[PDB]
Amino acid sequence: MAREVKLTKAGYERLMQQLERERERLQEATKILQELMESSDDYDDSGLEAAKQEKARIEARIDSLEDILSRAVILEEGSGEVIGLGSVVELEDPLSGERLSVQVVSPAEANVLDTPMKISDASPMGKALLGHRVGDVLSLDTPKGRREFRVVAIHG
């Protein structure tokens, strides 16, 4: 298990802040879990179980985050291509290791059906990406939860 992960300075400091946030959430999560154990001694309750799960969950995002960081290799500042119109961008979610491909195009070229989905220039995600390069880390709006992805490559 030895792979290098390229990140720009900004992309690196971005995963740090995320690690900082996660540790605080863990502290709060841990704290509530104990107060939840002393109270309803009976922990066969869905609550105590949902709490168990949340802490563990946070533990996961953090251990995964420390891993990514330990493999980090900082790219030069001015380096690689930039993401612009027509560019096809490959993304990885640090935690889940989920791959996501998307291509930024003009508003009228946007289409959900295309192979790498075509995203409007002025769409939320299109904005967020436009201007970034491999290594950068961006936060993208999600219904279930704002996630941060890493620019793995810009084939476009």
* Residue 20, marked binder: yes
* Residue 24, marked binder: yes
Cβ distance to its own copies smaller for residue 72 or 130: 72
**Residues 125 and 135: beta-carbon distance below 8 Å:** no
For the segment 62-81, give every residue that binds its own copies (CB under 8 A).
63, 65-67, 69-70
What is the Rg, in whole angstroms, of the alpha carbon atoms belonging to the chain? 19
Cβ distance to its own copies smaller for residue 67 or 109: 67
The listed partner (its own copies, Zn ion, none) that binds 154, CB under 5 to 8 Å by sort, is none
**Residues 104 and 85: beta-carbon distance below 8 Å:** yes
- Contact residues: its own copies, CB under 8 A: 1-2, 16, 19-20, 23-24, 26-27, 63, 65-67, 69-70
Known binding residues are 20, 24
